[PDB]
């Protein structure tokens, strides 16, 4: 169990760092953070019934 | 910069409607500059004669 804990922390945190790097790259790619926030509002809208 | 889109949805972080509004804004800008320029020309000395 301890072995699994120590291995899980590293595997999970590596996956997180990949995620954050990809997010910031997405912002810089699309333009302003707020523009990607607007498209995020539209996608959240399509995700609800609105 | 290039976009290669016939109807661009999101480029540089801007929505499809935002792009249309930006083009409309540029048209209005250019027409405003031309209009002011022609006003200054109509008030110019060269148009008095």
From Swiss-Prot, chain B:
This is Dynamin-like GTPase MGM1, small form. The chain holds residues 766 to 814 of 939 of the full protein. The lineage of its organism: Eukaryota, Fungi, Dikarya, Ascomycota, Pezizomycotina. It is found in: Mitochondrion intermembrane space. It comes from the Eukaryota. Constitutes the soluble short form (S-MGM1) generated by cleavage by PCP1, which plays a central role in mitochondrial inner membrane fusion and cristae morphology. The transmembrane long form (L-MGM1) and the S-MGM1 form higher-order helical assemblies that coordinate the fusion of mitochondrial inner membranes. Inner membrane-anchored L-MGM1 molecules initiate membrane remodeling by recruiting soluble S-MGM1 to rapidly polymerize into a flexible cylindrical scaffold encaging the mitochondrial inner membrane.
